[PDB]
Design a binder for this molecule. Structure first.
Ligand SMILES: OC[C@H]1O[C@@H](O)[C@H](O)[C@@H](O)[C@H]1O
Lengths: 158, 158
């Protein structure tokens, strides 16, 4: 029942006018792909969905040198929980180059992550709640995405 | 439940691998916005949703000369039906510049059309059914959108 657009500058965060909850959708749009960027720290790029208290509902980290895409969560001031892994980063973006899109479906019990058309994981949540903020973290030097990524939300669907 | 990406060239149509039904979403992305493109004939740009028999479930037309946006439907062979229109094109796009996106929510009994974050209309259907294909008609010379439009679909939502 509603669309929202956010330009997220590399290394910043954004508060949602409308929170993302069960049945809602969020897609991050990048106008570039640099699968040949520098060494991650260890992350080249990360995309996150936060809850009101600041907890990491979903942590999406892209690492070229480690050639893996990690997923995890963690309480506001606690340790990282059980992380999930998907090897071969460049392979998840196959089919499209020059740009890319990362979608996260809030399925209530899980976070379905899809890169372009390919579902990368059915991430069972380790932490529950509603998403009230998003972030795109990376340096201008080593990000695999454009300096500014556009987050599009589709809320009020259920 | 997933995502599908289609690169549509002005004047062509495309068949959906995943049909769009009640509870589903389609968004056309344009990488430009020329509001000085010239006069339509009478249309500058049109975006359409088709049933399997060719009928126009939803027809959206942008006309700069008439400074109005049109919505309608019609059977493969029948005549256009009751035209629904909204004035001031530029106003609908106010907010973002070198680009634009148009979203359509299939609400079963209505198609909600949102430009960027602005709902332009809650279109009561004149014809119902699932969307089997899409199209984007315009010429290079007067289209208000980029020469190639990217439609993205989110299906299996309901
Ligand atoms: O009612 C919608 C129709 O309006 C006509 O005037 C136009 O020639 C058609 O292309 C279609 O847009």
């Amino acid at each position: 029942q509603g669309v929202n657009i956010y330009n997220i500058s590399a290394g910043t965060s954004v508060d949602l006018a409308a929170p993302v909850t069960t049945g809602d959708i969020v897609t991050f749009f990048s106008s570039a792909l640099n699968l040949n960027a520098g060494a991650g720290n260890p992350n080249n790029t990360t995309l996150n969905l936060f809850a009101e208290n600041g907890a990491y509902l979903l942590h999406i980290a892209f690492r070229l040198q480690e050639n893996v895409i990690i997923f995890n969560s963690r309480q506001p001031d606690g340790p990282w929980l059980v992380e999930q892994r998907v090897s071969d980063v460049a392979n998840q973006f196959a089919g499209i180059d020059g740009k890319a899109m990362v979608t996260v479906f809030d399925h209530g019990d899980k976070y379905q992550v899809v890169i372009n058309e390919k579902t990368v994981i059915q991430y069972t949540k380790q932490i529950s709640g509603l998403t009230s903020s998003l972030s795109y973290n990376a340096t201008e030097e080593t990000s695999i995405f454009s300096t500014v990524v556009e987050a599009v939300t589709y809320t009020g669907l259920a």
